[PDB]
Write a protein that binds this ligand. Structure first.
Ligand SMILES: N=C(N)NCCC[C@@H]1NC(=O)[C@H](CCCCN)NC(=O)[C@@H](Cc2ccccc2)NC(=O)[C@@H](CC(=O)O)NC(=O)CNC1=O
Lengths: 734, 475
C-alpha cells in the first residue's frame, strides 16, 4: 500500500465524516466512487437538525465530495398537529453499504412517535437507493411497540449486502436489547413499498424471533457479516453479540435460507466485547471462508502480572470447529486492537487473501493505526506486513483513525486491491492504493574463489605495474504482475571492502574506474531472463596491513528510484522477502596450509652489546634482538619494542649481511616510546631472524642506575595475535 | 610508634585539645621531669598525673525526658506517646552513638465512600442498602477511631435509550406511565462529603428514594470512576486507606455501550463533578472500561468492594478477577457478608525518619532495627508493621571543629507519629587551667602564654621569646 502520499477526503467539521465507508460501482457508467457516511452532518431537510448525510466522492482527477439526497422531506406530521416522527439527531450514514448499483444507508437513532399513544421509539430506518428508485426500509417500525417489542430496535446499526443482493440489518435493541437480525430481497422491499403507511410489512421477510428474558441485553446484531458456511451457494449471516453468554460475548452464524442458527463462537474473557466487529473471508487458500472476531477490550497479563488492555482478534478456519486456531493481540495499552476488520482480497497477489485490522488508539500520540496481516497457507501471519498511521498532527480530540474500513476492491484498476480508512474524529477519510510488487533475486560469484597473495600475473592497462587481478560476476532477475511494464529498471551497487569501518585502509579496487566501489544502472525484462555481467578487480604492492582477514566482497541492489511512474501513477515496490543485501568472503592464500587456515607461533629473544653505560655525557648503545617463527609462514610481523626516556634511537644496522634488513620509524606519542620496526617481506616456515638496534644515551645525573626495555611481536594471523612481554636491562656504571 | 599527641610537640593545652579529641593534657604540677604534657590519658596516669588534674573528661550523652510510650490508643486520661529526649556533649571533631525506638499505638486512618444504586429495580432492596450503609459506619467505628465516611448515588446516563422522555410529564416523574411517583433520574450525584459525623451520614442515607429508567444495566461504573478521580470533591485523605463500596442489583454498562446512545468519546478518567455535585459529562462521555478503572484505582490507591445481590454475584466476581485487589460480597437483609470484607481490608493495612534543625557543623548516620530484630545498616525506615508493633533505630553523630556557641539542639522526626526526638548538644572545647599574662614560661617573661605562643613584646621574638631581632640575623 502507498503510505507516502495517500488520498484524503474532508467533510464538514464536526460531521463525523468517515464513520462508514464503502466502494460504489454502478452499472450505468464506468465511473468509480466512494461513499462516506457523516451521521452528524446538517442537511437540507426542513426542520431537521443534524440529520446526517452520505457523501459521494468520485475518484476523478478533480473532484469534491457531494451529498447524496436520499430524502428531502422533513418529519411527517400525524393527524392534527404534532409530528409523527423525529428525524433530528438521527445518525443517517452511520452505516453505508453498496451492491453494484444499489446503496443502503441507515439511520440507527431515528425515532418515531407511534399512534395509539405519545411515545418516542428509536426504531431506526434505512433508505435503499437503486439506479433510479429510492425506497425506505424500516422493518422494526412495526405494530409491536416499546422495549418489550421492537420500539428500541435501532434497525440498521449494522448492515451488509449478500452476493445476491439481500439486505441484512442488525438491530441490537429489539426485545429488551436482545437484538434481532432482519433481511429482505431488494425485490421484496420494492414490491411492498407503500410510503403512505408507516407500519408496512414485507411479506417474505426473514427475522430472528423473540427469546426468553434470560437473553436480554445481549445486543444481537451489533455487527454483521456475510459468508458461506453451510455450503450451498447462499451466503449465511454472521452477527456479533458482544454482551451475550453472560457478557463473555459470542458470534452466531445463521443459515441464509431460514435464519436458523448454525454455529456459535464464544469469547474467552468477560467484558472483552467479543463481537464488536466481525469479518468472513477465506485466508488459507481453500474454497471455504473463515471467521474473524474482534475483541477490542481484551486484557492480557503483563510481566508484573497485572492485566493490560490491548485488544485481540480471533481466527476460525473452516472446512467450523468451535475453538479458534490463531490469535492476534495488540501491543499497546488502550489501543482497542480489533475494532475494525476488512478483507483486503489478494493484496499482494501471492495467492492468498489478506486481512486489515484497526486499533483506533494505537500508534504514536494515540491517533490510531491499521495493521495489514498477510494471509497464507495455515492462516494469517503472526506479524503485520505494514502499519498505517494518520500523517496529520495529533490534536485535542482523537482522530479515531481506522475506526471504519473497506477493501477487496480495485479503484484505479491497476490490478491490486485498494483500501479505505476512515477517521471520523477529524471528519476525514483516506485512500490507500496497492502498488505493483516486484520479486527478484541476485547472484554473486568469483572465478578464482581463492586469491593468491603473490601470483601477480595480471598487468595494469598500458602500465608496467603487475598485480594479482581476479575475475568476478553478478546477476539479477525479476518478476512482476498486474499492469507492471515488463521493462523493469534497477540500480545495483558493488563494493569490495565496505566493511572496513572507522576509516580502515581501503585495499581493493575495480580495474575499470579504478575505484573500490561502483554503481551500475540496470534494466531487466520482467520474468524474461536471468541476466549476468562480469568485472575485473585487483588489490592495491599490498599497501594494507590487513592480510590477517579476507576481503569482504559486497553488493546491494534497489529499484531504480528516479524511474518514471506507471500509467496509473505509482512506482513498484520490492517484495519484503527479497535479499536486497548479499555478500561473500574471498580468502587470501600465500602459503597458509592445505586447509587454508594456518596456525602460526612466535619465538623471540633480546640482548645488548654495551650493557655498561656511563653518566654525564653522550654514550653509544646497541640492542640486539632475534626472532624465530613457527607455522605456515609469517607476515605483518613488527618489532613492538619499548625504549627508555633517557636514550634516543639512531637507526638499525643495515650494513651487515649477518643481520636482517629491517625498516624502522620510531614513535614517541607517550612515555611508552616504541622503536616500531618492520621485519620486511613475508617469510616461510622455520625462518630465523636477527637484528641490532643502535641507541644514544643521555643520562644527566647519577640518580638513575639502569635502563629497561620491554618488547612484543605480532603474529602471522589471528591465532596468538600478539606475543607475551619480554624484558631486558642495561646497567649504568658511573 | 609514638602517638600524634606527643609527636607534634604540643606546647599548650589549647593546642593539645585542637590536635585531637583523644589527646589529653596534664595540668598537675607533680608531673615527672621530662614527661610530655600532651599525651593519651593512660600515659599521663602512668606518669602519676592526678586524674582530676587531667584535661579530658570523656564525652557523654544522657536522657533529658524519658516518659514511657503508651500501650493503648484510647487515651483514657492523657495524650498517647509513640516515640525519648536526650542531651549530648562533644569535644572538637568528636562523635557519639545512641539508639531509639517507636511504636504504632493509634488506630489507622480509614476512608469509606458508599455508592448507592437508586434505580427503580432497587425499590425492594432500598432497606438493605440503607441498612448496610448504617452498619458500615457503625461497625467501622469499633475498629478505628478516626473514620471518615460519605456517600453518593447513581442511576444511569440521562439520555434517550435509558431515560424516559416520551411525554413531557415523564421528565419530571419518570414513573408517570406507571401512574406513580418517583424522582427525576440522574447520572451520578455526590451527596455527602467524607466526614466523621456518622449521625449525619445515617440521616442522609435514610432519606434517599429511587428513580427510574428503562434498561436493566445501570451506569454504576461512571460513578466509580468519578468517585476515584474527584479526590478534592470526595475528600480522600492523602494518608488514609481508601475503601469504595459499590452496591447494585443488576448488571452494569461498560465502554462501547454508549454507541447505542450516540456516545463514542472514551471516558477521560478525569473529574467532571461541578458545584451542583452532578457528573456533568454523563451524556457526552462513554462508560469506562475495566482497564481504565484498574489504572485509576491503583493510581489513587483505592480498594473497591462490590456489594451486589445474588443474581449478579457471579458477573461481578468475574469482574473482580480482572481488577486486582477487589473483592465481592452478597447484598441481602443479613449484611454480615459484606461487613467481613471491611474487616479484612482493615486487617491488612510504616515509618520513616526526617531530621530538622540540624547544626551547620554537625553530621549524622543512621541504621535500622526492623521487625524480627533484623538489623539493616544505613536504613532509616521500616515497613510492614501493624498496630502494636515496635521498631528501633540507631544513630551516630559527629562534629567537625568546634563552634563558639556553648549549646544548641536539633531533633529527628518520624513520619506522622506526632512526636519529636529533640536532642540537645553542648560543646566543652576549653581547658580548666586556661581560665586565667607575663608568664614565667616565656624567656625571662616578656610574653603572654596563650594559644601555645608567647606573643613576645618589643625586643623579643620566637615561640618562647628565645630570640631577639639584633641576634636573629637574616643569614
Ligand atoms: N422481553 C423481555 N425479555 N422482558 C423481560 C425483561 C424483565 C425485566 N424485569 C421486570 O420486568 C421486573 C418484573 C418482575 C421481576 C422484577 N425485576 N421488573 C423490573 O425489572 C423493574 C422494576 C422492579 C425491579 C425489582 C423488583 C420489582 C420491580 N426493574 C428495573 O430495573 C427497570 C428499569 C430500572 O429502574 O432500572 N426495568 C428493567 O430493568 C428491565 N425490564 C424488565 O422488564
Amino acid at each position: 500500500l502507498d503510505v507516502d502520499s495517500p488520498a484524503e477526503y474532508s467533510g464538514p467539521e464536526g460531521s463525523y465524516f468517515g464513520f462508514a465507508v464503502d466502494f460504489f460501482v454502478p452499472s450505468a457508467s464506468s465511473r468509480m466512487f466512494l461513499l462516506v457516511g457523516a451521521p452528524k452532518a446538517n442537511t437540507t431537510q426542513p426542520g431537521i437538525v443534524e440529520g446526517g448525510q452520505v457523501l459521494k466522492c468520485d475518484w476523478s482527477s478533480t473532484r469534491r465530495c457531494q451529498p447524496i439526497e436520499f430524502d428531502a422531506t422533513g418529519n411527517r406530521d400525524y393527524a392534527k398537529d404534532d409530528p409523527l416522527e423525529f428525524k433530528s439527531h438521527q445518525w443517517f450514514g452511520a452505516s453505508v453499504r453498496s451492491k453494484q448499483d444499489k446503496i443502503l444507508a441507515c439511520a440507527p437513532l431515528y425515532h418515531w412517535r407511534t399512534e395509539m399513544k405519545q411515545e418516542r421509539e428509536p426504531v431506526g430506518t434505512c433508505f435503499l437507493q437503486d439506479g433510479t428508485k429510492t425506497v425506505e426500509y424500516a422493518p422494526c417500525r412495526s405494530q409491536d411497540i416499546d422495549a418489550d417489542g421492537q420500539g428500541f430496535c435501532q434497525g440498521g446499526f449494522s448492515i451488509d449486502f449478500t452476493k445476491a443482493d439481500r439486505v441484512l440489518l442488525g438491530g441490537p435493541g429489539s426485545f429488551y436489547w436482545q437484538g434481532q437480525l432482519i433481511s429482505d430481497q431488494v425485490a421484496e422491499i420494492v414490491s411492498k413499498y407503500d410510503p403512505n403507511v408507516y407500519s408496512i410489512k414485507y411479506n417474505n421477510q426473514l427475522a430472528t424471533r423473540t427469546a426468553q428474558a434470560i437473553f436480554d441485553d445481549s445486543y444481537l446484531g451489533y455487527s454483521v457479516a456475510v459468508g458461506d458456511f453451510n455450503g450451498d451457494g447462499i451466503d449465511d449471516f454472521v452477527s456479533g453479540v458482544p454482551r451475550a453468554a453472560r457478557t463473555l460475548g459470542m458470534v452466531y452464524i445463521y443459515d441464509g435460507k431460514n435464519m436458523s442458527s448454525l454455529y456459535n463462537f464464544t469469547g474467552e474473557q468477560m467484558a472483552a466485547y467479543f463481537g464488536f466487529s466481525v469479518a468472513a473471508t477465506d485466508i488459507n487458500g481453500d474454497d471455504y471462508a473463515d471467521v474473524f472476531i474482534g475483541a477490542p477490550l481484551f486484557m492480557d497479563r503483563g510481566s508484573d502480572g497485572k492485566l493490560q488492555e490491548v485488544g485481540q482478534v480471533s481466527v476460525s478456519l473452516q472446512r467450523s470447529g468451535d475453538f479458534q486456531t490463531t490469535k492476534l493481540n495488540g501491543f499497546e495499552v488502550f489501543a482497542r486492537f480489533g475494532s475494525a476488520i476488512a478483507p483486503l482480497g489478494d493484496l499482494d497477489q501471492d495467492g492468498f487473501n489478506d486481512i486489515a485490522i484497526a486499533a483506533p488508539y494505537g500508534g504514536e500520540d494515540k491517533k490510531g493505526i491499521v495493521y495489514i496481516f498477510n494471509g497464507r497457507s495455515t492462516g494469517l501471519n503472526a506479524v503485520p506486513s505494514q502499519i498505517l498511521e494518520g500523517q496529520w498532527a495529533a490534536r485535542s480530540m482523537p482522530p479515531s483513525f481506522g475506526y471504519s474500513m473497506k477493501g477487496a476492491t480495485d479503484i484505479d484498476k491497476n490490478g491490486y486491491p485498494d483500501l479505505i480508512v476512515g477517521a471520523f474524529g477529524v471528519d476525514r477519510a483516506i485512500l490507500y492504493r496497492a502498488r505493483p510488487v516486484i520479486t527478484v533475486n541476485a547472484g554473486l560469484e568469483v572465478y578464482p574463489s581463492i586469491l593468491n597473495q603473490d601470483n601477480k600475473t595480471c598487468s595494469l592497462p598500458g602500465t608496467a605495474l603487475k598485480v594479482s587481478c581476479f575475475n568476478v560476476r553478478f546477476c539479477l532477475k525479476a518478476d512482476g504482475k498486474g499492469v507492471l511494464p515488463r521493462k523493469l529498471n534497477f540500480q545495483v551497487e558493488l563494493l569490495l571492502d565496505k566493511l572496513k569501518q572507522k576509516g580502515a585502509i581501503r585495499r581493493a579496487l575495480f580495474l575499470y574506474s579504478r575505484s573500490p566501489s561502483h554503481s551500475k544502472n540496470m534494466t531487466i525484462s520482467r520474468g524474461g531472463l536471468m541476466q549476468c555481467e562480469e568485472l575485473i578487480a585487483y588489490l592495491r604492492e599490498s599497501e594494507f596491513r590487513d592480510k590477517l582477514t579476507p576481503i569482504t566482497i559486497f553488493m546491494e541492489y534497489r529499484l531504480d528510484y528516479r524511474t518514471a511512474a506507471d500509467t496509473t501513477g505509482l512506482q513498484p515496490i520490492l517484495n519484503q522477502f527479497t535479499p536486497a543485501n548479499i555478500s561473500r568472503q574471498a580468502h587470501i592464500l600465500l602459503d597458509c596450509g592445505e586447509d587454508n587456515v594456518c596456525k602460526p607461533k612466535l619465538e623471540v629473544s633480546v640482548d645488548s652489546d654495551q650493557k655498561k653505560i656511563y653518566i654525564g655525557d653522550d654514550n653509544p648503545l646497541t640492542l640486539i634482538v632475534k626472532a624465530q617463527n613457527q607455522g605456515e609462514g609469517a607476515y605483518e610481523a613488527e618489532l613492538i619494542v619499548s625504549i627508555p626516556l633517557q636514550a634516543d634511537f639512531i637507526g638499525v644496522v643495515r650494513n651487515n649481511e649477518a643481520l636482517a634488513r629491517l625498516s624502522c620509524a620510531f614513535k614517541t606519542e607517550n612515555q611508552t616510546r616504541q622503536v616500531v620496526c618492520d621485519l620486511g617481506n613475508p617469510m616461510k616456515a622455520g625462518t630465523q631472524l636477527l637484528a641490532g638496534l643502535r641507541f644514544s644515551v643521555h643520562q644527566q645525573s647519577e640518580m638513575d642506575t639502569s635502563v629497561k626495555f620491554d618488547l612484543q611481536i605480532q603474529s602471522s594471523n589471528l591465532f596468538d595475535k600478539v606475543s607475551p612481554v619480554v624484558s631486558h636491562k642495561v646497567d649504568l656504571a658511573v | 610508634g609514638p602517638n600524634i599527641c606527643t609527636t607534634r610537640g604540643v606546647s599548650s593545652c589549647q593546642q593539645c585539645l585542637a590536635v585531637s579529641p583523644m589527646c589529653a593534657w596534664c595540668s598537675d604540677e607533680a608531673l615527672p621531669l621530662g614527661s610530655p604534657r600532651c599525651d593519651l590519658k593512660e600515659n599521663l596516669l602512668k606518669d602519676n598525673c592526678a586524674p582530676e588534674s587531667i584535661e579530658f573528661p570523656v564525652s557523654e550523652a544522657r536522657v533529658l525526658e524519658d516518659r514511657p510510650l503508651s500501650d493503648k490508643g484510647s487515651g483514657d486520661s492523657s495524650q498517647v506517646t509513640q516515640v525519648q529526649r536526650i542531651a549530648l556533649r562533644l569535644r572538637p571533631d568528636d562523635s557519639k552513638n545512641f539508639s531509639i525506638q517507636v511504636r504504632q499505638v493509634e488506630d489507622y486512618p480509614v476512608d469509606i465512600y458508599y455508592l448507592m444504586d437508586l434505580s427503580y429495580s432497587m425499590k425492594d432492596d432500598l432497606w438493605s442498602i440503607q441498612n448496610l450503609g448504617t452498619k458500615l459506619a457503625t461497625q467501622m467505628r469499633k475498629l478505628t477511631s478516626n473514620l471518615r465516611i460519605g456517600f453518593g448515588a447513581f442511576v444511569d446516563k440521562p439520555v434517550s435509550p435509558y431515560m424516559y422522555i416520551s411525554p413531557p410529564e415523564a421528565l419530571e416523574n419518570p414513573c408517570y406511565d406507571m401512574k406513580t411517583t418517583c424522582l427525576p433520574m440522574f447520572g451520578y450525584k455526590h451527596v455527602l462529603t467524607l466526614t466523621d459525623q456518622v449521625t449525619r451520614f445515617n440521616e442522609e442515607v435514610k432519606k434517599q428514594s429511587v428513580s427510574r429508567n428503562r434498561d436493566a444495566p445501570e451506569g454504576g461504573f461512571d460513578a466509580i470512576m468519578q468517585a476515584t478521580v474527584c479526590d478534592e470533591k470526595i475528600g480522600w485523605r492523602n494518608d488514609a486507606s481508601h475503601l469504595l463500596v459499590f452496591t447494585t442489583d443488576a448488571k452494569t454498562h461498560i465502554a462501547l455501550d454508549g454507541r447505542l446512545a450516540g456516545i463514542v468519546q472514551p471516558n477521560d478518567g478525569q473529574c467532571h463533578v461541578g458545584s451542583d455535585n452532578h457528573y456533568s459529562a454523563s451524556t457526552t462521555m462513554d462508560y469506562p472500561s475495566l482497564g481504565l478503572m484498574t489504572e485509576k484505582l491503583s493510581q489513587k490507591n483505592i480498594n473497591l468492594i462490590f456489594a451486589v445481590t445474588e443474581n449478579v454475584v457471579n458477573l461481578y466476581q468475574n469482574y473482580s478477577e480482572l481488577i486486582p485487589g477487589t473483592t465481592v460480597g452478597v447484598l441481602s437483609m443479613d449484611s454480615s457478608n459484606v461487613l467481613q470484607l471491611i474487616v479484612d481490608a482493615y486487617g491488612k493495612i510504616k515509618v520513616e525518619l526526617e531530621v530538622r534543625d540540624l547544626p551547620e557543623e554537625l553530621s549524622l548516620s543512621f541504621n535500622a532495627t526492623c521487625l524480627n530484630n533484623e538489623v539493616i545498616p544505613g536504613l532509616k525506615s521500616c515497613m510492614g508493621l501493624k498496630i502494636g508493633d515496635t521498631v528501633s533505630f540507631s544513630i551516630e553523630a559527629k562534629v567537625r571543629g568546634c563552634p563558639q556557641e556553648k549549646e544548641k539542639s536539633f531533633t529527628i522526626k518520624p513520619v506522622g507519629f506526632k512526636d519529636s526526638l529533640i536532642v540537645q548538644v553542648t560543646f566543652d572545647c576549653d581547658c580548666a587551667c586556661q581560665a586565667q599574662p607575663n608568664s614565667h614560661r616565656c624567656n625571662n617573661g616578656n610574653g603572654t602564654f596563650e594559644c601555645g605562643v608567647c606573643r613576645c613584646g618589643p625586643g623579643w621574638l620566637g615561640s618562647q621569646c628565645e630570640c631577639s631581632e639584633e641576634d636573629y640575623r637574616p643569614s
